[PDB]
Design a binder for this molecule. Sequence first.
Ligand code: HEM
Ligand code: NAG
Ligand code: NAG
Ligand code: NAG
Ligand code: NAG
Ligand code: NAG
Ligand code: 1NP
Ligand code: 1NP
Ligand code: 1NP
Ligand code: 1NP
Ligand code: 1NP
Ligand code: CL
Ligand code: MG
Length: 324
Amino acid sequence: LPPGPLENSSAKLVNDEAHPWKPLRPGDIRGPCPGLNTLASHGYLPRNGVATPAQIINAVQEGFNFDNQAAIFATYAAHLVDGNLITDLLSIGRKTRLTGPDPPPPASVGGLNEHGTFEGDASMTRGDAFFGNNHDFNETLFEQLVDYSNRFGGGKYNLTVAGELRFKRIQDSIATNPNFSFVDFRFFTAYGETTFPANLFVDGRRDDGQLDMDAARSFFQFSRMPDDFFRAPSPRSGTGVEVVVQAHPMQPGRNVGKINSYTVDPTSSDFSTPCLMYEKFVNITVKSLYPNPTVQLRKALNTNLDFLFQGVAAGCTQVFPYGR
Ligand code: HEM
Ligand SMILES: *[C@@H]1O[C@H](CO)[C@@H](O)[C@H](O)[C@H]1NC(C)=O
Ligand SMILES: *[C@@H]1O[C@H](CO)[C@@H](O)[C@H](O)[C@H]1NC(C)=O
Ligand SMILES: *[C@@H]1O[C@H](CO)[C@@H](O)[C@H](O)[C@H]1NC(C)=O
Ligand SMILES: *[C@@H]1O[C@H](CO)[C@@H](O)[C@H](O)[C@H]1NC(C)=O
Ligand SMILES: *[C@@H]1O[C@H](CO)[C@@H](O)[C@H](O)[C@H]1NC(C)=O
Ligand SMILES: Oc1cccc2ccccc12
Ligand SMILES: Oc1cccc2ccccc12
Ligand SMILES: Oc1cccc2ccccc12
Ligand SMILES: Oc1cccc2ccccc12
Ligand SMILES: Oc1cccc2ccccc12
Ligand SMILES: [Cl-]
Ligand SMILES: [Mg+2]
């Protein structure tokens, strides 16, 4: 079952004796998420980067005070599209034999590195998949984050910086990635993720929304909590995303095989239709990976879809692609 919320959600030291940072060993997997990467590199998750959904939910809550509903929604969304539903294992990065025997195609079980399922374009510190690497820390992109922090945040990353940088990334992908896609699930996640450094990488004794660049580099590049890091003082995820959207409101769309051809998609969900985002994720995205599953896969899909629905925070009706 999905873990419940923390019994005690106070700020506390999370870079503690039981959770030291360690460098990668051969075979250890890290991916496009600095949050999960840091949890693995401090042993809140298995240090090889392969974990169960329950391990992930417990880790994001314990290590960073990510809220329960957000933890459930993201984890089961990722697991459904990128994880092995029979073995209950998900890679936080590249595809690996460590998640067990694969299901039939068209399911990919590609880990969080799989482009276009959860991971997508216009990430802050990772390049678009079209440019060759959607998962490793990129120094040039991080230096741009530093520059935007200097210009809009007095040298710190905050929600104002997030609003400007989110738009800059989108405009750079429009100008250079002929395959740029910015619809449905990615349209939502791209905005939410820009709040996370301000909400969750800021030491919880301060919780002022102002992330310094030493801490930012530590998390984004090295998957490493600052010495004496205290987690956030209460559960949260995407609060302040309205500030990021308001700075430069966008419509969902994609380039259409050429640069500078961004074409709005009226069949995409947007922030006015969160329940459509959920329904398409299940009916189209998940269903297309598993169109006619065998008995044990069908059971695992339905269980994980029930868990996903527990995380749906927008008053939506559950949908059932494989029946009740
Ligand atoms: C709850 C389970 C979570 C999963 C499965 C997850 C997975 C992912 C994935 C696959 C991405 C790639 C999105 C992209 O293409 O840019 C991403 C982005 C990101 N996640 Fe998470 N995430 C989770 C929770 C968290 C938490 C708790 C934090 C912080 C504590 C966090 C911080 C970030 C950041 C900062 C990015 C954007 C990085 C960048 O654009 O450079 N995530 N997440
Ligand atoms: C919750 O944890 C904090 C920090 O560890 C501690 O100060 C506080 O006493 C705890 N609360 C309860 C009810 O145990
Ligand atoms: C190109 O875009 C499509 C989605 O429209 C996606 O399936 C494909 O993986 C993308 N490839 C790259 C390398 O961006
Ligand atoms: C990092 O991002 C820059 C800017 O988009 C890109 O030119 C470069 O190839 C990327 N990769 C590395 C390894 O720097
Ligand atoms: C970001 O920092 C700048 C400079 O200190 C400030 O003007 C702006 O109000 C800050 N934004 C937020 C949301 O804290
Ligand atoms: C999803 O499928 C259900 C039937 O299982 C249907 O009622 C619903 O309208 C579908 N939603 C979308 C957005 O296709
Ligand atoms: O874990 C996550 C990663 C990226 C985006 C998210 C948006 C909402 C809730 C969780 C998210
Ligand atoms: O309202 C939102 C929009 C997009 C992403 C989010 C992630 C977490 C929490 C709320 C979010
Ligand atoms: O953060 C949020 C929470 C709930 C609803 C939202 C709607 C739009 C934009 C952001 C939102
Ligand atoms: O865009 C939105 C509108 C209303 C409620 C939401 C809840 C979560 C995430 C997004 C939302
Ligand atoms: O719980 C949520 C968090 C972020 C985005 C969402 C979009 C739709 C439905 C639920 C959502
Ligand atoms: Cl919570
Ligand atoms: Mg990306």
